[PDB]
Amino acid sequence: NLENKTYVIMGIANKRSIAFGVAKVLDQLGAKLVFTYRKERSRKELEKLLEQLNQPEAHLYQIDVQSDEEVINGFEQIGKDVGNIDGVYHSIAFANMEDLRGRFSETSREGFLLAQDISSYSLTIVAHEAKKLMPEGGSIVATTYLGGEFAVQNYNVMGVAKASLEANVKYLALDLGPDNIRVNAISAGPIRTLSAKGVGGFNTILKEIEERAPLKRNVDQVEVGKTAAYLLSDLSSGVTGENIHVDSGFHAIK
Amino acid sequence: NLENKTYVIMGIANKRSIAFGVAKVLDQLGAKLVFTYRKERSRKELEKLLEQLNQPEAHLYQIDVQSDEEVINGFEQIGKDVGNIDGVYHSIAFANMEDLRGRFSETSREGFLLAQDISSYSLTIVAHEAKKLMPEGGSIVATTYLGGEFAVQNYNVMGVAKASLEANVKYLALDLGPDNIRVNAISAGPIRTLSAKGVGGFNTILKEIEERAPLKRNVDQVEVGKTAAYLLSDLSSGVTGENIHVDSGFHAIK
Amino acid sequence: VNLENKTYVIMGIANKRSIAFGVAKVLDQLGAKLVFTYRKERSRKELEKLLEQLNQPEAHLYQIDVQSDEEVINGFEQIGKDVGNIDGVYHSIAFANMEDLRGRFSETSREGFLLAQDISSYSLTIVAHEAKKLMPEGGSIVATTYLGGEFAVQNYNVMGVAKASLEANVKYLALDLGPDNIRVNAISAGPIRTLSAKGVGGFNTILKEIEERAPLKRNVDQVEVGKTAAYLLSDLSSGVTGENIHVDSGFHAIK
Amino acid sequence: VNLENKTYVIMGIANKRSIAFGVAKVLDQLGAKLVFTYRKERSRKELEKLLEQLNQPEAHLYQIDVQSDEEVINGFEQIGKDVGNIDGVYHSIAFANMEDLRGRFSETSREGFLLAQDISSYSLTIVAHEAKKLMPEGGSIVATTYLGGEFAVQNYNVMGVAKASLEANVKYLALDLGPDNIRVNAISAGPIRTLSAKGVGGFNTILKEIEERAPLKRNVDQVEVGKTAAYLLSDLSSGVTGENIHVDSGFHAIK
Ligand SMILES: NC(=O)c1ccc[n+]([C@@H]2O[C@H](COP(=O)([O-])OP(=O)(O)OC[C@H]3O[C@@H](n4cnc5c(N)ncnc54)[C@H](OP(=O)(O)O)[C@@H]3O)[C@@H](O)[C@H]2O)c1
Ligand SMILES: NC(=O)c1ccc[n+]([C@@H]2O[C@H](COP(=O)([O-])OP(=O)(O)OC[C@H]3O[C@@H](n4cnc5c(N)ncnc54)[C@H](OP(=O)(O)O)[C@@H]3O)[C@@H](O)[C@H]2O)c1
Ligand SMILES: NC(=O)c1ccc[n+]([C@@H]2O[C@H](COP(=O)([O-])OP(=O)(O)OC[C@H]3O[C@@H](n4cnc5c(N)ncnc54)[C@H](OP(=O)(O)O)[C@@H]3O)[C@@H](O)[C@H]2O)c1
Numbered sequence A, B: 001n002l003e004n005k006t007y008v009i010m011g012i013a014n015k016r017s018i019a020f021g022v023a024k025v026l027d028q029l030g031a032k033l034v035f036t037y038r039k040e041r042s043r044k045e046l047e048k049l050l051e052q053l054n055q056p057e058a059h060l061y062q063i064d065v066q067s068d069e070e071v072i073n074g075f076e077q078i079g080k081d082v083g084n085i086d087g088v089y090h091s092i093a094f095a096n097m098e099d100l101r102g103r104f105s106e107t108s109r110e111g112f113l114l115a116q117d118i119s120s121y122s123l124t125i126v127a128h129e130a131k132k133l134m135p136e137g138g139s140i141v142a143t144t145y146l147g148g149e150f151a152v153q154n155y156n157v158m159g160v161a162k163a164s165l166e167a168n169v170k171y172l173a174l175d176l177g178p179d180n181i182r183v184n185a186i187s188a189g190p191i192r193t194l195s196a197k198g199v200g201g202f203n204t205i206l207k208e209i210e211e212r213a214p215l216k217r218n219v220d221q222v223e224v225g226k227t228a229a230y231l232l233s234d235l236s237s238g239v240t241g242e243n244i245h246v247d248s249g250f251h252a253i254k
Numbered sequence C, D: 001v002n003l004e005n006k007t008y009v010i011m012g013i014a015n016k017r018s019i020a021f022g023v024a025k026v027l028d029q030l031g032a033k034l035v036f037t038y039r040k041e042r043s044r045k046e047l048e049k050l051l052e053q054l055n056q057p058e059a060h061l062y063q064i065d066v067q068s069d070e071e072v073i074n075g076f077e078q079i080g081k082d083v084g085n086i087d088g089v090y091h092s093i094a095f096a097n098m099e100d101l102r103g104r105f106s107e108t109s110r111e112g113f114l115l116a117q118d119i120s121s122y123s124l125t126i127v128a129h130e131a132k133k134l135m136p137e138g139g140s141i142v143a144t145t146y147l148g149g150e151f152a153v154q155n156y157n158v159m160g161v162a163k164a165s166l167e168a169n170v171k172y173l174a175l176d177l178g179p180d181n182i183r184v185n186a187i188s189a190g191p192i193r194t195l196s197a198k199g200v201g202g203f204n205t206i207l208k209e210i211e212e213r214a215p216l217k218r219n220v221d222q223v224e225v226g227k228t229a230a231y232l233l234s235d236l237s238s239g240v241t242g243e244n245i246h247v248d249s250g251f252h253a254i255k
């Protein structure tokens, strides 16, 4: 139970977002939630989805993780509005569509560095600023994909940025561990979301899971959220620097 | 909440067993529990340990995992007395003490096959027998150590037996996944227990976690039990063939 | 690589398609003196005629069933008297009953599970203990594994567990023997048509998936495994121990 | 090995202690023609002194700052006009600010993080793209990584996230370029005292932990990295791709 606990959830675009899976689960367990968004359209979606939640107050902050000033001021404002928090769910990534299909060897520098910036660096700066609101410790979770551990077709520039993210989680775990702040990753299997439309061959990936993965079925957003609940809570206190696969066992097979 | 769940916990020897840590967490959460032990000396012990839980019944069965018939009849009796189960915590391993120190290259065939048998194969046979009591599915968790993934001073024959176990998990996950039976490992940090007295250099291992692991501290039997509650419940429903390190972040550093 | 003046024990040739025979042709091509161990008389007969293909001046052949402590102990002790000190050992030995290489892993028998471990994993430990006696100045031991030990693969079953055990064995052997300057490593070979592959269910599907999905879009062969063996058994790999080199067209790196 | 008639581009020699200079001594001794690329004028100057221990009859030296596309694009094009087709590339380039390396990882600045990615990871992708034009019939590309990419090690900080990225880059490049018969691999070198190492906090106690704890109980040197690179750049390692080979006395295999 997560009553009297407060979590910042970053990166809901709409009802299919993985972060909205997380939100539904933490809200059901009684947490207070704060939400961050980039696009105006995502604030609108967030105001609509809050009616499904039991949060008595909408706490919505615009944070583009490309901007230091936005991350620093956003968290500073969260802290002024709700006090100390207990953890952060990071559910944010981006790459240019043309870097998620075709040949990897042709990725542009700005494309590679944009992926890195949003998808991996954002976690370091978020952790640095969120730590100011966790004086007594807490928990930070980021969303990764099996394409960060192995070359999968079409995932390209995002795989290299997932590899970077998963290491960023381990370096943060080491750095922040003596502050009693745990940092972990959830490696979600494929899920139909807005961002998934940019992964060439997504539908093929989906069915390969059904066909080959141990559980012979795809996972959904709520399953990711139930693992997020474990990682964000005291159920997982001994656990830091870890990557938990919520992917029907696919990571364990070949 | 594990009310109306039944779990079989294997491998309680005394108050310091990891499995009594698991027992305690699941008991607090409303689980009915069934226990298995090897020798009477653990039985009498066991019976007194249970007056610290709120099981209204002492469901207790002798099972030496070296005998097929005792594992077969043991699970058979468990089903007759308490019907279907929701999963199994496996907390069982053994090696002869001279193989847990000195030079690995001098391990005997007998001692090697004995560690494999008790520490690894026993999950396969237990899985096959447990499954008969999980027609709607369920969850199997084994306990492993970082020694299965890396060579570690002294742990020697038990490291090749853990490597074996960790692969056994994976292969059981693939096999039993279509029956909705999930199989996972918890990789526990070092913990002072009866078995840990057999491991050469054990105190040096304890101390090194405190100096070097991200959280700068040792884990305990209840932190293992907490993660076992995650793995054994529906929070982990999309998680299988997984190895979760409950070890203060130690797996994640070098 | 120059292997003139060097002597290697290659264990586990049954016929011309053996992975160890690939190893043998490369080392032989490289100037090395080779010693061979076999279990079955039929395998010794294959060695006898496969040796006409090689440049070995004489046939050093020893029956070693790795299930027997006596046979491993006396075979290496014999090897040491006949050829003197050795430079390393190529281990290419596995076994599992056929029932245990298809269908349901969860049905595996104890006797079948310990059989696969005994032959395919423990044999490396004892072979190293006895081989070390002949490498007073250091040396190099290489064993043969499969991706099935790092991931659950359909049908590979009791063997993938035996290969996990093997790969841990190499690391623990590496740590123990490193002070003696004896390096210990694994080659993880892609699928190759051999006599033992005949017992692994869906083998043909395995080979086809490699060709369609692995980076190199082709299968590897025994000689390619031999080349990496030559690297691993020679001074080119000084500094490398406890390592598992995958010779598999890149397959291990993709999902 | 045997490498006469092969031409390799070697990127990242600064001085006589560079890991790349060890690669180059091994390749040169094996008969290869070598082409060198450098960033700083002082590195060129060192290259010219060092070529003198080499059996290279021609200094082929090209300035390439891997921060600039046009420099990588033009340098390789120029290399093509000067030596023609090439057999492989040794990439031995990384960089990170002292200001981010020697403060807490969580305080790494955006520009510092992205500097290290750009120079130490992205540089391989663009180099691979331009090198491929000179490998019509296949080739081999090797980059230099460090255990810090796979585990959080104290002090290495922003460079371990850059190495993690580099190591994914190898895999993704091996997958993309394998159909062109171009193999891409990494060497994970142990600590070696170089100009760059002077940037890594606590470097001396890292050297000492290797002597004390690594299976081989010693450190490795640049020449050892060069020997594993000759294996990787040569037909010895055909069938090997997307691989990370650890030249670290086996320190990767232990805990
Ligand atoms: N779907 C999958 O199968 C899958 C699998 C494994 C991992 N993941 C990971 O899960 C995470 C969430 O993705 P999703 O699939 O749930 O898709 P999503 O709904 O499209 O969410 C992606 C989010 O990232 C936010 N974002 C992008 N750039 C940002 C920026 N510069 N600053 C702040 N926010 C930014 C987007 O916000 P705006 O819309 O406001 O721009 C959006 O809310 C990603 O890390 C993804 O890589 C997804
Ligand atoms: N403690 C640690 O630091 C550590 C760390 C990582 C992983 N683990 C793992 O945790 C698990 C539990 O060990 P522990 O530390 O909790 O020690 P423990 O309290 O001594 O428990 C070991 C149990 O194994 C049982 N056992 C041994 N052989 C058996 C057999 N043939 N049949 C049935 N039961 C058998 C023992 O029963 P009897 O006493 O009745 O013989 C005992 O209850 C083991 O798998 C261990 O390897 C331990
Ligand atoms: N083929 C593949 O796709 C593949 C892939 C990866 C790894 N591997 C591994 O490569 C190694 C060689 O196998 P292979 O495919 O080359 O098949 P093979 O030609 O069938 O070789 C197997 C060898 O093991 C020997 N052997 C079995 N039990 C023995 C025992 N108790 N004592 C002494 N020798 C014993 C056999 O000798 P006898 O016939 O005389 O009994 C035979 O020479 C094995 O470890 C296998 O797991 C093979």
Ligand SMILES: NC(=O)c1ccc[n+]([C@@H]2O[C@H](COP(=O)([O-])OP(=O)(O)OC[C@H]3O[C@@H](n4cnc5c(N)ncnc54)[C@H](OP(=O)(O)O)[C@@H]3O)[C@@H](O)[C@H]2O)c1
Binding pocket: D011, D012, D013, D014, D015, D017, D018, D019, D020, D038, D039, D040, D041, D043, D064, D065, D066, D067, D092, D093, D094, D095, D119, D144, D145, D146, D188, D189, D190, D191, D192, D193, D194, D195, D196, D197
């Ligand atoms: N030494 C170790 O303990 C160790 C261990 C494992 C891995 N490594 C890796 O080995 C590789 C070689 O490093 P090292 O130890 O040999 O150090 P080094 O002698 O200082 O070599 C590093 C090279 O990187 C080059 N470089 C940096 N920025 C560049 C740029 N923008 N464009 C072109 N070249 C650039 C430098 O050239 P300029 O001098 O012209 O700027 C220098 O030649 C690096 O990737 C390092 O991370 C080193």
Ligand SMILES: Oc1cc(Cl)ccc1Oc1ccccc1
Binding pocket: A093, A094, A095, A100, A144, A145, A158, A189, A190, A191, A193, A195, A196, A197, A198, A199, A205
């Ligand atoms: O990381 C993702 C993996 C899958 Cl399988 C589908 C969607 C994913 O999310 C993104 C994919 C590319 C760019 C940004 C987010």
Ligand SMILES: Oc1cc(Cl)ccc1Oc1ccccc1
Binding pocket: B093, B094, B095, B100, B144, B145, B158, B189, B190, B191, B195, B196, B197, B198, B199, B205
């Ligand atoms: O697996 C164990 C690891 C550690 Cl660190 C301590 C105790 C452990 O449990 C056993 C260790 C050796 C033999 C049997 C059980």
Ligand SMILES: Oc1cc(Cl)ccc1Oc1ccccc1
Binding pocket: C094, C095, C096, C101, C145, C146, C159, C190, C191, C192, C194, C196, C197, C198, C199, C200, C206
């Ligand atoms: O280990 C092997 C892997 C593959 Cl894909 C094919 C054959 C192999 O060799 C053996 C497989 C099973 C039993 C003994 C040897």
Ligand SMILES: Oc1cc(Cl)ccc1Oc1ccccc1
Binding pocket: D094, D095, D096, D145, D146, D159, D190, D191, D192, D194, D196, D197, D198, D199, D200, D206
């Ligand atoms: O990557 C390195 C690892 C070690 Cl241990 C020492 C030196 C290394 O090389 C660099 C370290 C930091 C920035 C540039 C290169």
Ligand SMILES: N[C@@H](CCC(=O)O)C(=O)O
Binding pocket: A101, A197, A199, A200, A201, A202, A203, A204
């Ligand atoms: N968007 C994918 C379509 C293929 C699929 O999803 O299967 C592509 O353009 O490659």
Ligand SMILES: N[C@@H](CCC(=O)O)C(=O)O
Binding pocket: C102, C198, C200, C201, C202, C203, C204, C205
């Ligand atoms: N070996 C297979 C036959 C077909 C195949 O190899 O794919 C089996 O017995 O199942």
Ligand SMILES: N[C@@H](CCC(=O)O)C(=O)O
Binding pocket: D198, D200, D201, D202, D203, D204, D205
């Ligand atoms: N390089 C260290 C000094 C001593 C060491 O290498 O251990 C530092 O400047 O932080």
